[PDB]
């Protein structure tokens, strides 16, 4: 939906999911 952090705001939870996935992707 809306991300306060990195200026991101999409109406698709996949986007955030990708953010968390990629962000959490790194050790
Ligand atoms: Zn963010």
Swiss-Prot record:
Transcription regulator required for brain development. Probably acts as a transcription factor that binds to the promoter of target genes and recruits PHF8 histone demethylase, leading to activated expression of genes involved in neuron development, such as KDM5C. May compete with transcription factor ARX for activation of expression of KDM5C. It is found in: Nucleus. It comes from Homo sapiens (Human). It is linked to Intellectual developmental disorder, X-linked 97: A disorder characterized by significantly below average general intellectual functioning associated with impairments in adaptive behavior and manifested during the developmental period. Expressed in neural tissues. Zn(2+) binds at residues 3, 6, 19. Disulfide bonds: none annotated. The sixth zinc finger contains a Phe residue, Phe-23, instead of the final His residue normally found in C2H2-type zinc fingers. There is another His residue a few residues downstream, His-26, but this is not involved in coordinating zinc. Despite the His to Phe substitution, the zinc finger retains the ability to bind zinc using a tridentate metal-binding site of Cys-3, Cys-6 and His-19. The zinc finger also has hydrolytic activity against 4-nitrophenyl acetate. A zinc finger (C2H2-type) spans 1-23. It comes from the Eukaryota. Interacts with PHF8. This is Zinc finger protein 711. The chain holds residues 562 to 588 of 761 of the full protein. Belongs to the krueppel C2H2-type zinc-finger protein family.
């Amino acid at each position: 939906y809306k991300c306060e952090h990195c200026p991101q705001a999409f109406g698709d939870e996949r986007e955030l999911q990708r953010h968390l996935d990629l962000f959490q992707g790194h050790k």
